[PDB]
Ligand code: HEM
């Protein structure tokens with residue numbers, strides 16, 4: 183019987199990779215698929231071809247926003263914001279933004295530890311079961327990014343609640359995404375006018391905004407940096423930590439090893455990054471030229487999707503790809519933070535968030551385990567991340 187073109191994404195589950203991925207990688211490491219909008223796209227699933235695409239700027243992020251382009255999903259931001267980092271660089275702000283979001287600031291790591299330990303103490307006092315997403319990982323992500331941005335901790339929860347819509351992966355425009363975007367922009371604009379905001383990213387942007395060398399950088403861009411970096415950082419670190427905790431809980435031998443030898447946690451987090459399924463869709467790019475990728479000539483104007491778990495579970499680059507092995511010779515060569523022009527600017531902060539969160543969890547709850555059968559986790563659909571709605575644990 184005739185069938186329709188293969189549809190992406192394959193599965194919203196973040197606890198297992200579908201067998202189809204390895205089948206595609208072996209047989210058709212670049213092949214045509216249909217996205218949720220009805221558009222056709224090239225899905226790339228081998229390490230070699232994923233890295234080729236991400237290292238060639240003629241596969242353009244900014245052009246994915248063009249009117250009439252084949253789309254992975256609907257925009258939840260204004261089209262100019264797709265080029266956010268390019269706008270930050272053109273404004274002379276890239277070095278200052280990067281420096282502000284490093285985990286190297288004095289007292290930042292101790293703040294993370296204190297916050298993690300307080301969250302865990304509250305869960306222990308309340309008694310099992312505990313929800314490690316809603317009452318540990320996501321609050322830790324939110325508190326971290328309020329600190330990094332320099333904004334009041336009490337404003338975190340409301341900003342966080344915008345994100346279950348802001349990072350939807352939808353076939354159609356989302357009215358609530360515009361409401362939340364506009365409200366979050368007003369908030370960050372007020373922060374830039376708030377005299378008591380003098381630390382972190384927003385404190386630095388506030389100063390530069392009044393410096394004559396930035397006098398024609400737009401107030402809209404300054405506010406956009408705050409919204410985009412809070413939102414991307416919080417959704418990415420919260421979702422990554424949550425699904426890493428699942429992979430750790432399902433490996434009691436590894437859990438016990440990292441509990442016994444916490445100095446191995448950075449290597450453990452790097453493997454947890456490699457095997458992480460938090461990105462629900464391939465990374466989108468639009469070809470600006472005719473470019474050969476494997477056996478396919480991609481034509482100008484076509485959509486390409488870079489499947490991160492295709493690359494990261496490729497046995498030709500990571501032998502025994504499904505096994506967490508702390509002594510690989512190429513441990514940071516995974517694509518969990520992307521590659522090339524748009525490599526994640528928060529990579530160091532995301533690493534340290536997960537490292538400290540796990541260190542604290544294993545000390546407080548060394549017997550941590552799922553409180554429900556793993557198939558009972560509820561995986562969020564039509565979202566740019568894969569996450570369980572709740573993560574119930576005991577200890
Ligand atoms: C474990 C945590 C994180 C993961 C797994 C992650 C993942 C990624 C990936 C894969 C990309 C590349 C997207 C592409 O090329 O299309 C990216 C870009 C980006 N990330 Fe992260 N990220 C994390 C944490 C953060 C944090 C903490 C921040 C900010 C505080 C952040 C802000 C951004 C921004 C703004 C971009 C866009 C860069 C550009 O367009 O050039 N991310 N991230």
Ligand SMILES: O=C(NCc1ccncc1)c1cn(-c2ccccc2)nc1-c1ccncc1
Nearest residue numbers: 258259264266348349359362363366410413414
């Ligand atoms: O969807 C978002 N990014 C993924 C994307 C993928 C392909 N094409 C466009 C965008 C996104 C959503 N928000 C947002 C935040 C608060 C309220 C409403 C929306 N911010 C961003 C964002 C973060 C960092 N850099 C740029 C954009």
